[PDB]
Amino acid sequence: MNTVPFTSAPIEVTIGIDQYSFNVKENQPFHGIKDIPIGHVHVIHFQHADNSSMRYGYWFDCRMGNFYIQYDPKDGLYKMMEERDGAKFENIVHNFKERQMMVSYPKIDEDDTWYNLTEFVQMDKIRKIVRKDENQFSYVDSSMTTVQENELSDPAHSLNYTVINFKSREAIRPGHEMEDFLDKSYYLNTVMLQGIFKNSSNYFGELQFAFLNAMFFGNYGSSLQWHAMIELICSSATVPKHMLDKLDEILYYQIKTLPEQYSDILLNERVWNICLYSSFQKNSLHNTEKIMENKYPELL
């Protein structure tokens, strides 16, 4: 089990760790988060009590380094940083464990939620979407735009998601215009899966990462990417049977986890109704359709 220690908590802040969250008061004696499961990526995120504007946070994998949080009073945010001195970090983390000034990652034993939301997410792919090569962890916030959003502004602070555009020459073979627009299988299977992502695991990883940035940061371009990647599968008549089964599981746990009160802004009525009721795959997402109908029957 790994640990993310904090220098201090000088400003009152709501701290998220994966799907959990807790409040810390101004100058409360808080030194961090312990018992973080090894084997998964994680995200530690922040919303300041005094300016709910800008949720921000850090994707990280504890197997890649020892990471700590230090408040920067100049830039005004909790920053993640790496400590290279292993001896000292373990000593610092041991002292705080002894003085019980850390919250425990509160994983219920029966609970596979986080695994099910991050099954295909890999820190190496995150770092290609979020380009900042000097750090092993990745910063995301509410306001960051995507490469596709910029095409339609600072490129160093963008989310480099894979561009999906259904009315593009990449998506449409010359002389297959109707065929390829109405059945997107060539774009899904040849262009994106064989061509760009190489396999469905990388595709699902980006899909899952886009959803999580949408949910945890209210990042609008991430929400766009998540829906686009769902729509491309739902709108393909020919999808490997194992991808459809896995997609149904992925979406089920995403819909299960979404706050009930954020559905209005994180769920696109058109995509979901198309995917569940009109599309080629309308009969292939049984788990997802059941949870959507029972939890968000208004959207549909």
Binding site: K167, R169, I172, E177, M178, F181
Partner: protein, 237 residues
């Protein structure tokens, strides 16, 4: 974006543009089968592609063979239209290609956008105008060439005849849309008005009769009377 009454003079500026109407592409007669079921029989159709400034009409005749063995023909018809319009644009020299294409029905937007991906600078627009171009097949010489076709064929017409020698494009378009609106609302009466006087003929190389300016004013008034009359017969007013 969309084309309406606030930007109507745009149609007659010097940016090349075409209206595309797909109403008459897929045409059928519905009939009873021997078993008493219902079946359709396709008949020849046409794409109506019109330059509103010049009157140049590119009439692509859609022969019934194009539907053979195909499914979902009303959806295919939109994509076949888009394919044929795209092929027309590619066939034109660069300086004759449109800068905008206005579709009369919003369902043509995506088919045409997809077929025109190679032309990102050509704007594809809908319109809020309810234009009467479906009545093109009430012009006898256009109906004749469509019904006689035994194969796909493109035929070029000027739908304004020689009117632009005497009137502006704006007025010529207004006359055309009045004539077509009348033919759409009551075809028999409209054609009666157009041909009642045998001394006024249709030149071999024209679509409409050779009316003088005075006679066109009278014709135009009769067509508005007809349209108002039908509106009254329809709504009892």
């Amino acid at each position: 974006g969309a084309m309406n009454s606030s930007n109507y003079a745009e149609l007659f500026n010097n940016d090349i543009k075409l209206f595309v109407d797909d109403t008459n592409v897929y045409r059928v007669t519905v009939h009873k089968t021997f078993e008493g079921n219902v079946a359709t029989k396709a008949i020849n159709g046409c794409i109506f592609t019109l330059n509103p400034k010049t009157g140049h009409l590119f009439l692509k005749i859609i022969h019934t063979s194009v539907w053979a063995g195909q499914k979902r023909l009303s959806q295919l018809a939109k994509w076949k239209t888009a394919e044929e319009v795209s092929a027309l644009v590619r066939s034109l020299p660069k300086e004759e290609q449109p800068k905008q294409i206005i579709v009369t029905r919003k369902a043509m937007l995506d088919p045409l956008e997809v077929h025109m991906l190679d032309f990102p600078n050509i704007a594809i627009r809908p319109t809020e105008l309810r234009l009467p171009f479906s009545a093109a097949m009430s012009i006898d010489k256009l109906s004749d060439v469509v019904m006689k076709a035994t194969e796909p064929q493109m035929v070029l017409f000027n739908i304004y005849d020689d009117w632009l020698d005497r009137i502006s494009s704006y007025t010529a378009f207004s006359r055309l849309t009045l004539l077509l609106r009348a033919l759409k609302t009551n075809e028999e009466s409209a054609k009666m008005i157009l041909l009642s006087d045998p001394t006024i003929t249709i030149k071999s190389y024209h679509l409409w009769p050779s009316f003088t300016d005075e006679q066109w004013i009278t014709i135009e008034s009769q067509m508005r009377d007809l349209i108002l009359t039908e509106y009254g017969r329809k709504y009892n007013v």
